[PDB]
Amino acid sequence: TIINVKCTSPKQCSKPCKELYGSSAGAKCMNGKCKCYNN
């Protein structure tokens, strides 16, 4: 469960992932791309 949103922070990735998974989002920023998991 990896998406394609450009980031430079995990709080730039908690924008698409909390629009997806709600509030149970494990939002990780590796390189400059976003991953959306679950808490």
Q: Which residue has the tokens 């989002």?
A: 25
Cα Rg of the chain, angstroms: 8
And the tokens for 3? 């998406």
Q: Tell me how the structure was determined.
A: NMR
Q: Burial code of 2-39, b = ≥16 C-beta within 10 A, e = fewer?
A: eeebebeeeeebbebbeeebeeebebbbeeeebbbeee
